Amino acid sequence: QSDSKIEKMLPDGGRLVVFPNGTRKELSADGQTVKVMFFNGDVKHTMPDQRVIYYYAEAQTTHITYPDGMEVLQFPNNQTEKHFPDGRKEITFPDQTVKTLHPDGREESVLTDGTIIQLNPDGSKVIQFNTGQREIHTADFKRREYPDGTVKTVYSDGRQETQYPTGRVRLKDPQGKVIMDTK
Amino acid sequence: DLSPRPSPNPHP
């Protein structure tokens, strides 16, 4: 592409190159370091330790690319995103929740208290608590699994099933009345 | 390349 380009020579032996589209590039004397100052205000610095650091002037965002392929974006609202080469993304929101988006469509958030929420691509959720309790939410019911082995399920029509650690199963109508009991 | 990268978007 570009032909109408201008180079100048730094006293240290580095080069400054100015391009007709406005882009400026600074190369060290060994050529090993490159600073690119784009016409739009963006800035790209390649590093000694090999990080590539890009600054988006309008969006006010920095974007680091690391040697293993990881990209890490730091947004003005103090939010950070890590993008991995298999397509996984890990978002750290301002309030320090971490959410991962996996390739398959799962999302997995970890809360400030260590509670884990997993959002499958079918719409169902799994919550896992510190206490050992799990909840499972599908479109038909919400199920709580307790550490003692008790499982309570509330269906979308308001019927509630308890399953006791022994295997006994009690089902109640919306009103609270037992309508089935496996003894 | 010489051209700026496209502006990026945070996740909602």
Author numbering:
A (entry chain A): 941 to 1123
B (entry chain C): 414 to 425
Pull verbatim passages from the article behind this deposition.
To understand how CPAP and STIL interact at the molecular level, we obtained the crystal structures of the TCP-domain of D. rerio CPAP937–1124, both on its own and in a complex with D. rerio STIL408–428. In both structures, the TCP domain adopts a nearly identical conformation, suggesting that no significant conformational change occurs in CPAP upon binding to STIL (RMSD = 1.5 Å ± 0.2 Å over 148 ± 4 Cα pairs). The structure of the CPAP–STIL complex revealed that the STIL peptide binds in a polyproline II helical conformation along one edge of the TCP domain β-sheet. The STIL peptide binds to CPAP by four main mechanisms. First, three STIL prolines (P417, P421, and P423) pack against aromatic CPAP residues (F978, Y996, and F1015) in a way that resembles target motif recognition by other described proline-rich motif (PRM) binding domains. Second, R418 (STIL) makes a cation-π interaction with the phenyl ring of Y994 (CPAP). Third, STIL R418 is further involved in a water-mediated hydrogen bonding network that includes CPAP residues H1003 and T1005. Finally, sidechain–mainchain interactions are formed between CPAP residues Y994, Q1019, and E1021 and the bound STIL peptide. The CPAP and STIL residues involved in this interaction are highly conserved across metazoans. We conclude that the TCP domain of CPAP adopts a unique extended open β-sheet conformation that recognises a series of conserved prolines in the CR2 region of STIL.
